[PDB]
């Protein structure tokens, strides 16, 4: 009647994504971990946009939506800053938020290319990411146009809105042949092999295997630069986990007070 | 005292010079009016280069280029048809044949 | 004492009409014109 | 003609020297009914079972 | 309800031969849609789905 | 308009790529060594580059001033 | 000297040629 | 990829050779899986790019 | 606007793609739709039987 | 592709009596049907086949 | 603008609830004196856009935005027709997120 | 009434951070018409503040 | 313009509660907890979790709508044990197997880097 003992071990590790695997837990254990990799887990992304100059050719609007996309590195501040709409203070504060800064002007005679270079930031932790490849193209200015705005970060997560989502993309796959006929194929060697198919190149799919559960759920978790692709893992498992933390404490209070 | 040249004023002074060299029948006012415009449509386009000198300059090179290549791959994906002619079986494809 | 300034077309100046004036630039004349943005608070969200 | 249109732009050959030189046609509705127009120009222009042996124009 | 019509002098398109009654000439479209259909039958498939 | 910052589908920054790709094919690279010389794998994050037209710098011709 | 199954991309140059001379609006 | 009409050379048996070329079923099936349960779905979805437009007419 | 360059489109604030081929009337733009109608100058032999005619030459 | 060679046969098969009734009508052999002129007995092998 | 008659004219101005006896029951002061909105604000259903009194004291006359429309101003130009009056085209430009109910071909 | 018509900025709650102007307010509430999105919503009037909009050295 | 804002699918209104037990009456010990302001992700680790609870005979969770942000779980046990405590014994080693699965992540990762 209890609990699991999954066991995980990183295949791949670089700075951009993380390939692991996880053994012996459930299927619904395995996809909801990766549904909190997409929308819940924090990131500091653009969310306020205060446009004083905008003589561009995009719109005022189309700035604002351009920034808020521009990722930005949180990584050890994500976890001490507060969601705005819980700091106790008017009009942002450095404990609740980031605060950026465009001026550009363009002068010269060539076309300008306003990059998150531009952006520059009152926090020198929480940049774009610009650290260590070009860099994010907002506009592109002609002689005497401009753009002047500050703008302020927030925390959020990816189930509020796509910019603040950590991932470029995440792989889940298990069950590479297709031993417990989860899915059925028509032909099934019109079908290629997957990348961690313990197969030869005789057989198609695994002889059918009746009394079987999922286990090893094969990941592939890769970040979009903002945090690293080891930390939008630690921190799913800590916001799944406070989920239901939070969800038992709610019903206790719910079981005492009937 | 305000040259007009300067600034937006090209184009329609282009026409204008253009009609007044054209509303002559001397031709000392068309051969100075041809004079003119050569010398303002040259100041023109050096301006208009000098402001696509980056970034737009970069994007004629490479659309010259891929139009090129185009002409090229087409020549030579033309080359491998008519090289691959052993024997076209395969069926998802017809054809009339009247008469 | 806000003079109600305007852009023009053609030359990019800014002039100041008040009423009853007829719009044109102060140079090269011109006879469309545009006005200046606003002074107000714009926010928006990234969003 | 497709090697001198090929070098168009970069001297001037054009569409009017294909017509001026007699290679394509106008041909129009009252006087497409006694052409006898061909689809592709290989493919049927070529030697067979006869279908007709007599085009007069063919398509582009 | 009859067969495409001699709507050229005595020839349904000019690529076909006077007085041809043969199924190709008439409109019977012999390709499926995932062959895609011949120039003449895409005309006469519109000759007819008008 | 201008190039994307994300990928529609996936997430993934292609707003850097846009004057890379271009670069590369101005160098000599063909157009599907290019693209994944920048490292797009996925075809949701090779369509954006692929198919982006550049209207911005079509738009910054229309100069408001010089 | 005649042309042959190399004419896709022959049938295409009078073509673009076409549409160089005369825009589509031409008969406007 | 070039989409003319009445073509010749381009056929679905040659669009799907070169699709298995990288790697992917070659009539264009994939096997996707539920993204709420995360099981997978046991027929194979038909999924690629198509061009989609935006009719003006907004609710 | 006529035989004028590219950059001169643009410097009058037009485009270059525009085709052209209208009228700006009170700063709208009208185009001229085609009509067709009969050719003229030709005889052209129908044959209406609602009425008291075999045949009918029109012209 | 098996699907695809039976279908062909029998499209070709089709082509070819259509033929032959366009030769017999050509050589004056299709009689009428008895309720029909010539041209709608024509026609109606043809639409049959 | 225009002149209407001999004791009738129309004048590009902001009304008042003082003079201007017709008059909305909406927010004239986001359009500047001039009686003109400026670009960057935003407006919403039944905000004036251009503010014109028409003498009679002084009739309002003005402009509104249509019902639920909601833009912000994009910009305001100000000119001369033939006849040589003022003649103004404000456009008023709104982001449309692809909710659900839109149309996709 | 005396907010209305002015510029406020939402200063607690979900809107946490949102300019928009006043439209309509009572002795509760106000509806606040927002600059970014196209709604008006309606918050409390202790969770706004005012911001004002305005230029000072007139000369 | 009748579009919710999007902070509505987990942030909790004035008045509603997070979670809300309601006997059912159909068949003798079972019982709907409805969460408010929750999702598949949450909903469905629960109840696979409560299916491998031997004393568990029924569990399930719906999403009446996706337009509305709530889930129904309806249990039902065995009549020596009532689902009040099935469902947070359910959550109780949920936790200690994400708990689990976070340290055996980190050691993992410390000893890719450089291991
Ligand atoms: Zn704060
Ligand atoms: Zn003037
Ligand atoms: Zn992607």
């Not at chain 1, 950590?166 to 290629?192: C, I, M, Q, S």
């Not at chain 7, 022959?10 to 005369?22: G, L, P, Q």
């Not at chain 12, 102007?21 to 970014?36: C, G, M, N, Q, Y």
Request: charged share 30%; net charge negative.
């Amino acid at each position: 009647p209890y609990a699991n003992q999954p066991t995980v071990r990183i295949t791949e590790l670089t700075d951009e994504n993380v390939k692991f695997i996880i053994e012996n837990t459930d299927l619904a254990v395995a996809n909801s971990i990766r549904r909190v990799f997409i929308a819940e887990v924090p990131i500091i992304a653009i969310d306020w946009v205060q446009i004083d100059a905008n003589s561009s050719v995009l719109h005022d609007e189309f700035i604002a939506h351009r920034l808020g996309l521009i990722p930005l590195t949180s990584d050890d501040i994500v976890d001490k800053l507060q969601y705005s709409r819980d700091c106790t203070c008017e009009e942002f504060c450095p404990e609740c938020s980031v605060e950026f800064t465009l001026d550009v002007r363009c002068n010269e005679d060539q076309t300008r290319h306003v990059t998150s270079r531009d952006l520059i930031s009152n926090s020198p932790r929480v940049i774009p990411v610009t650290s260590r490849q070009d860099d994010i193209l907002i506009v592109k200015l002609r002689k005497g146009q401009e753009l002047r705005l500050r703008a302020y970060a927030k925390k959020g997560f990816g189930k509020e809105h796509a910019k603040w989502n950590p991932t470029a993309g995440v792989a889940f796959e298990y069950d590479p042949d297709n031993a417990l006929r989860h899915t059925v194929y028509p032909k099934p060697e019109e079908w290629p092999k997957s990348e961690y198919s313990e197969l030869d190149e005789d057989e198609s799919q695994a002889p059918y295997d009746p009394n079987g559960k999922p286990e090893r759920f094969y990941y592939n978790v890769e970040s979009c630069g903002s945090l690293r692709p080891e930390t939008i893992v630690l921190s799913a498992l800590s916001g799944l986990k406070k989920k239901l933390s939070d969800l038992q404490t709610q019903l206790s209070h719910e079981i005492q007070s009937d | 005292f305000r040259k007009a040249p300067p600034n937006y004023a090209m184009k329609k002074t282009q026409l204008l010079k253009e009609k007044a060299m054209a509303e002559d029948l001397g031709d000392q006012d068309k051969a100075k009016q041809i004079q003119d415009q050569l010398n303002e449509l040259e100041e023109r386009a050096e301006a208009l280069d000098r402001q696509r000198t980056k970034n737009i300059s970069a994007i004629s090179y490479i659309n010259q280029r891929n139009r090129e290549w185009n002409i090229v791959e087409s020549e030579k994906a033309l080359v491998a048809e008519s090289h691959n002619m052993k024997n076209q079986q395969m069926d998802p494809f017809t054809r009339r044949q009247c008469k | 004492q806000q003079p109600m300034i305007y852009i023009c077309g053609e030359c990019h100046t800014e002039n100041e009409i008040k009423s009853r004036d007829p719009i044109r630039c102060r140079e090269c004349g011109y006879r469309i014109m545009y006005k200046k943005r606003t002074k107000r608070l714009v926010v928006f969200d990234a969003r | 003609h497709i090697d001198q249109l090929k070098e168009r732009e970069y001297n001037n050959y054009s569409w009017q020297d294909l017509v001026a030189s007699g290679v394509v046609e106008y041909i129009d509705t009252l006087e497409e009914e006694t052409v006898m127009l061909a689809m592709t120009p290989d493919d049927l222009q070529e030697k067979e079972v006869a279908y007709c042996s007599t085009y007069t124009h063919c398509e582009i | 309800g009859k067969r495409i019509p001699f709507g050229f002098k005595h020839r349904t398109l000019p690529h076909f031969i006077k007085d041809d009654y043969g199924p190709e000439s008439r409109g019977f479209v012999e390709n499926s849609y995932l062959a895609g259909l011949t120039p003449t039958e895409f005309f006469f498939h519109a000759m007819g789905g008008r | 308009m201008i190039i994307p910052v994300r990928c529609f589908t996936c997430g993934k920054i292609v707003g850097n790529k846009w004057e890379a790709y271009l670069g590369l094919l101005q160098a000599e690279y063909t157009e599907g060594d290019a693209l994944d010389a920048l490292g797009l794998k996925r075809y949701c994050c090779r369509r954006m580059l692929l198919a982006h037209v550049d209207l911005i710098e079509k738009l910054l011709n229309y100069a408001p001033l010089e | 000297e005649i042309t042959p199954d190399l004419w896709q991309e022959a049938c295409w140059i009078v073509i673009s040629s076409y549409f160089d001379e005369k825009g589509l609006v031409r008969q406007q | 990829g070039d989409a003319t009409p009445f073509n010749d050379a381009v056929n679905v048996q040659k669009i799907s050779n070169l699709l298995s070329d990288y790697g992917y079923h070659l009539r264009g099936n994939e096997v996707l899986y539920n993204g709420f349960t995360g099981r997978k779905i046991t027929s194979q979805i038909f999924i690629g790019p198509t061009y989609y437009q935006r009719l003006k007419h907004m609710v | 606007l006529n035989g004028l360059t590219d950059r001169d489109l643009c410097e009058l604030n037009e485009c270059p793609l525009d085709p052209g081929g209208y009228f700006i009337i009170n700063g709208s733009e009208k185009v001229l739709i085609a009509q067709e109608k009969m050719a003229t100058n030709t005889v052209y032999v129908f044959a209406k039987k609602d009425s008291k005619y075999a045949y009918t030459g029109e012209c | 592709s098996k699907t695809y060679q039976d279908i062909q046969n029998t499209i070709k098969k089709a082509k070819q009596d259509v033929i032959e009734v366009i030769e017999k009508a050509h050589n004056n052999e299709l009689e009428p049907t008895p309720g029909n002129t010539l041209r709608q007995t024509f026609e109606n092998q043809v639409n049959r086949i | 603008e225009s002149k209407k008659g001999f004791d009738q004219e129309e004048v590009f101005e902001k009304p008042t609830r003082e003079t201007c006896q017709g008059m909305r029951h909406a927010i004239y002061d986001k359009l500047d004196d001039d009686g003109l909105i400026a670009p960057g604000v935003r407006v919403s259903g039944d905000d004036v856009i251009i503010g014109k009194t028409v003498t009679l004291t002084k009739r309002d006359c003005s402009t509104f935005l249509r019902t639920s429309e909601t833009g912000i101003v994009d910009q305001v130009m100000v000119t001369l027709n033939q006849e040589g009056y003022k003649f103004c085209k404000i456009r008023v430009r709104s982001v449309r997120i692809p909710q659900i109910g839109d149309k996709f071909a | 009434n005396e907010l209305i018509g002015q510029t406020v900025r939402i200063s607690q709650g979900p809107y946490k951070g949102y300019i928009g102007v006043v439209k309509d307010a009572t002795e509760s509430t106000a509806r606040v018409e927002l600059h970014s999105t196209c709604q008006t919503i309606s918050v409390d009037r202790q969770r706004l503040t005012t911001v004002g909009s305005r230029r000072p050295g007139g000369m | 313009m009748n579009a919710p804002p999007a902070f509505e699918s987990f942030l909790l209104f004035e008045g509603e509660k997070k979670i809300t037990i309601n006997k059912d009456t159909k068949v003798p010990n079972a019982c709907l907890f409805t969460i408010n302001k929750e999702d598949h992700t949450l909903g469905n680790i629960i109840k696979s979790q409560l299916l491998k609870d031997p004393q568990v005979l029924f569990a399930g969770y719906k999403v009446p709508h996706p337009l509305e942000h709530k889930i129904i779980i309806r249990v039902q046990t065995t009549p020596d044990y009532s689902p009040q405590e099935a469902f947070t014994n359910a959550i109780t080693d949920l936790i200690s197997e994400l708990s689990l699965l976070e340290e055996r992540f980190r050691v993992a990762i410390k000893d890719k880097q450089e291991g």
